[PDB]
Nucleic acid binder design. Structure first.
Ligand SMILES: [Mg+2]
Ligand SMILES: [Mg+2]
Length: 958
RNA sequence: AUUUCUACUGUUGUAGAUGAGGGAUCUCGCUCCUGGAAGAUGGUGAU
RNA sequence: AUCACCAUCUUCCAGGAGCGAGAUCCCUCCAAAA
RNA sequence: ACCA
């Protein structure tokens, strides 16, 4: 479909020849080397109008509710300060320069601080409830005496603990500390955090005010920082091409004036295996700065002339008429003065801009940029030394790994673009791929943690890196988002959604997000929907013509020895067994050997679904088992974090102890865990005798026990973290228990239990069972959270969570291209709209959920094709899910969202039936998922796609 | 062994992904500095 | 036997700054002729 | 919707 301009930041390496922190920044265009700060006059005068507040309108900035007395008290407290003619602001901003101003955020902080100061003194000193009710602490007043006593019991207990600790000796001191920290201080803090209603409400109100202020604080901070970021340009840059390779020349502005003049006299003499390029261009965004930029001061010499062309002054004169603006700009280019100082190609502009007529301003911008962008070329004998002599030019070599290897046709995309920029054909499209006129250089020190311990390596020595920005699709409409109001982004999305047409779409992808399979994919086409069921079943059965072809590894332990005697395993890197050259080179085998190995090790089949947990693209084939290590790394990082966050990390020693286990031993531990898993309601109501049968139900094999209807009545309704915890489960679980007593006798105070790891089958192909030794070294009580630095422990889960998404986006894009080059039309990506309420629950249950990251990476992927609009504030548009509506659909470009109700069990053909088991509908229709889907778990994704398609077309009917 | 990340890894390096810099608000874990309160212990003064 | 004070010491609370993890968010990345 |  029709695209729009897109930007990316690509970088290379530089090798110095003649001479992180910004060592240098440069601009190819010679006329942006003396920049001046942007004209933000409007926004500065507009944001002050949002800062100012009128006292009486404060309480309507929040959803919270305060009684009238508290409202009056707060207003009185603020008025106490607003005397002497001060004016109130939503916050303090030293950059705008306001004075005699009073910050509301500071006052809200102070009235909270003073009261939390007085309340502690009152509670500590030993006053009474009636004394409290007579104080001026209007926030803490009116608490139930029950809470007051609940708090003072802990206070006095703590008091006791204090003097106990002072006269301490020996290991006793360790058992005291924990009892002081773990149970008393934390419980007391939570009591006041989550039970004092007015306190909670005021905390929420202050939070909302603080966030609101922070927004328009960040905006203004960026506005100010732009004023100083734009003074660091000093160099004019050139690219000297030779023998098919580029150099990089930086020349200071002290000499650019003479250097360009000298270069202008060079003779263009074809190709001699050496060229000295230099860029020139003008843009619409710069003409407005030229004409209506800083006009109020009157020193804009471009407005000492040209005024006759004006209607009165200032860009606001045009009132917003596109065709008056177009004509004024054409006249500006038509003026005698403008052509005397500008450097545009007068002939082509005159024959193609001034004389023409444009339908809209977008085309005027496109034509101006298209015709004003030039890439010159000159050549002369040994043209390197004159620069070093006359102009003191610094010189680097631009390089990278892909720019030095023998074979080509297999090269990284970010190098593909740079290779494609210089092609001759690209000069005849008017530079569709554009290299923007500003670039930067950075210098990185070596890692001492690598030097000391140490075989080529990046980090073993310093590096010079070049960062450049490249704009693809330079001849399509532009789109920018700075300073748009929140209500304009939604309108932008709605307008951009109009491009799609009802009969344009031809298929859809449905994606399901579980927790045993982190995600699942399925494909739907309109051809599946025949009239009779007998036709639907047959249409589905033709898997050979619809589904896609996938390879499955047959033996994950297979290994082979290469010529060096080293051994290699298939699981770690299958790409050394699928590609031909790699196998024949490394293992020195013959053609027949390769054919036999390929025919014996890998199975292949065509299906309608998949399982994105481990699928990967290897040498053009989709391997369903090509990415086990990336899943193991995630299931290991989750456990390593969990077993480190349940310790304690105070400086002073403590006796908290924790251990790993395969099963729980003492009934205290089982009773603690069962409580950790169940809902507080329907559990505390559970009889103290049945709390043992519940443990037997959770932790035994369920085969030798005669559990009655109680299981459905009670056990299955109070469980909120589902799973299988038996000893013979498919993926046996591995536990961590925490206590203090030395030997864990049958009567000990265990005060935490959790389930850490899942022993997924086929993890043993990488690591033996004993490699829980790895899961432990990352837990240690003595460690202080402040001390722990990177490169000795790593708690990050972001990278290991982006790895799986990186492997899944490849599969999804490959399938999208495959089907689009067969059906002739674009398709929709459908996933259910959980919103924000359920995303947090999903994170809680596992903490490695991939939903939001996968969505945020699909948006990044599919923008390049021009299929979703630019995104500014994602939470603005949705902020929530789609519930209780089985027809609605939320659309961002080609990415849809729907309600997930009743999708995971309905039969694709019979609808009314339910298909939780046997892979055949109980209604006895012809449906049978044996030869279609990888398992019975894919039926959700299919449905997720199905409902995604039918609804979308339904939206276009009117 | 990489502009950068992940799995490998040296007879041409291999398979997937890649928009980077600086900053704002909030939640959780910790440390140093200054101030307030409760209190343990040796000593000194006093009625 | 009681009351005031000096000094070492324990805990909790408030404010300032810094480190580690997660969530939401923002701006910059093309201008000038004497 | 997440799951012996
Ligand atoms: Mg689902
Ligand atoms: Mg699922």
């Amino acid at each position: 479909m029709e695209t729009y301009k897109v930007t990316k930041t690509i970088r290379f390496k530089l090798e110095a020849q003649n001479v992180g922190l910004p060592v240098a920044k440069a601009s190819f265009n010679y006329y942006t080397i003396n920049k001046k700060p942007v004209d933000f006059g409007n926004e500065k005068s507009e944001l002050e109008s949002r800062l100012k507040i009128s006292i009486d309108t404060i309480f309507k900035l929040t959803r919270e509710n305060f009684s009238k007395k508290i409202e009056e008290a707060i207003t009185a407290d603020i008025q106490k300060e607003l005397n002497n003619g001060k004016t109130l602001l939503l916050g303090d901003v030293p950059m705008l320069g306001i004075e005699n101003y009073v910050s509301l955020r500071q006052i809200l902080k102070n009235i909270k601080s003073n009261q939390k100061k007085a309340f502690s003194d009152l509670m500590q000193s030993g006053k009474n409830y009636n004394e409290l009710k007579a104080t001026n602490l209007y926030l803490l007043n009116t608490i139930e005496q029950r809470q007051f006593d609940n708090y003072k019991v802990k206070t006095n207990e703590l008091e006791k603990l204090a003097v106990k600790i002072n006269q301490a000796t020996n290991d006793n001191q360790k058992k005291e500390l924990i009892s002081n920290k773990q149970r008393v201080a934390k419980q007391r803090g939570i009591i006041m955090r989550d039970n004092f209603a007015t306190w909670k409400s005021f905390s929420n109100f202050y939070r909302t005010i603080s966030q609101e202020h922070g927004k328009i604080l960040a905006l203004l901070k960026g506005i100010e920082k732009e004023r100083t970021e734009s003074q660091l340009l000093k160099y004019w840059a050139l690219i000297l091409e030779n023998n098919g390779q580029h150099k990089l020349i930086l020349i200071p502005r002290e000499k650019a004036a003479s250097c360009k003049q000298w270069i202008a006299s060079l003779n263009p003499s074809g190709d001699k295996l050496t060229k000295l390029f230099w860029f020139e261009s003008l843009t619409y965004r710069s003409l407005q700065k030229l004409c209506f930029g800083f006009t109020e001061n009157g020193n804009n010499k471009f407005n000492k002339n040209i005024q006759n062309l004006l209607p009165i002054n200032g860009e606001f004169a045009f009132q917003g008429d596109e065709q008056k603006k177009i004509k004024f700009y054409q006249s500006v280019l038509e003026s005698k003065y403008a052509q005397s100082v500008l450097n545009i190609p007068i002939q082509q502009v005159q024959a193609d801009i001034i004389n023409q007529s444009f339908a809209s301003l977008d085309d005027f911008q496109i034509a101006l940029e298209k015709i004003c962008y030039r890439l010159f070329a000159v050549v002369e004998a040994n043209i390197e030394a004159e620069l070093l002599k006359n102009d003191k030019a610094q010189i680097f070599n631009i390089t990278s790994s892909d720019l030095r290897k023998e074979a080509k046709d297999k090269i990284k995309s970010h190098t593909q673009i740079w290779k494609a920029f210089w092609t001759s054909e690209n000069k005849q499209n008017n530079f569709e791929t554009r290299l923007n006129p500003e670039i930067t250089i950075t210098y990185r020190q070596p890692k001492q943690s690598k030097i000391d311990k140490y075989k080529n390596n990046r980090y073993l020595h310093a590096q010079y890196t070049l960062i450049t920005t490249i704009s693809e699709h330079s001849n399509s409409p532009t789109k920018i988002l700075s300073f748009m109001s929140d209500d304009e982004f939604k309108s932008s999305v709605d307008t951009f959604n109009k491009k799609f047409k009802k009969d344009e779409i031809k298929f859809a992808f449905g994606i399901d997000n579980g927790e045993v399979e982190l995600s699942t994919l399925g494909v739907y086409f309109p051809a599946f929907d025949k009239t009779t069921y007998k036709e639907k079943v047959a249409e589905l059965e033709k898997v050979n013509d619809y589904g896609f072809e996938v390879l499955t590894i047959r033996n994950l332990n297979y290994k082979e020895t290469d010529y060096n005697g080293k051994e290699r395993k298939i699981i770690q890197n299958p790409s050394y067994f699928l590609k031909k050259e790699n196998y024949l080179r490394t293992f020195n085998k013959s053609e027949t050997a390769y054919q036999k190995m390929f025919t014996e090790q890998f199975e292949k089949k065509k299906l309608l679904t998949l399982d994105l947990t481990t699928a990967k693209v290897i040498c053009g084939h989709i391997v369903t088992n090509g990415d086990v290590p990336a899943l193991f790394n995630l299931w290991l990082k989750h456990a390593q974090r969990n077993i480190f966050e349940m310790n304690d990390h105070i400086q002073k020693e403590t006796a908290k102890k924790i251990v790993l286990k395969n099963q729980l031993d003492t009934d205290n531990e089982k009773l603690k865990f069962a409580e950790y898993i169940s809902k507080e309601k329907e559990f505390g109501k559970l009889n103290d005798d049945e709390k043992m049968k519940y443990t037997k139900w959770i932790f035994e094999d369920r085969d030798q026990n005669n559990f009655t209807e109680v299981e459905n009545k009670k056990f299955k309704r109070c469980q909120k973290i589902y799973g299988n915890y038996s000893t013979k489960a498919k993926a046996p679980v591995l536990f961590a228990s925490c206590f203090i007593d030395e030997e864990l006798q049958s009567v000990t105070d265990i005060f935490d239990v959790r389930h850490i790891f899942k022993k997924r089958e086929d993890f043993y192909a990488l690591k033996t069972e004993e490699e829980i030794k790895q899961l432990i070294d990352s837990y240690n009580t003595n460690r202080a959270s402040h001390d722990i630095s990177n490169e000795e422990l790593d708690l990050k889960i972001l990278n290991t969570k982006k790895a799986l998404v990186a492997n899944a986006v490849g599969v999804i894009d490959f399938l999208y291209k495959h089907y689009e080059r067969r059906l002739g039309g674009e398709g929709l990506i459908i996933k259910e709209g959980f919103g924000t309420g359920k995303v947090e629950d999903g994170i809680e249950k596992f903490s490695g959920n991939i939903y939001r990251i996968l969505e945020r990476k699909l948006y990044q992927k599919f923008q390049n094709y021009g299929l979703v609009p630019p995104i500014k504030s994602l939470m603005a548009v949705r902020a929530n899910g789609i519930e209780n509506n089985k027809n609605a659909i939320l659309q961002l470009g080609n990415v849809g969202f729907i309600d997930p109700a009743g999708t995971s069990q309905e039969c694709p053909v019979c609808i009314e039936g339910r298909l939780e088991h046997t892979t055949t509908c109980p209604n006895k229709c012809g449906f049978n998922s044996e030869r279609i889907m990888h398992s019975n778990d894919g039926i959700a994704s299919f449905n997720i796609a199905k409902r995604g398609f039918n609804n979308f077309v339904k939206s276009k009917t009117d």
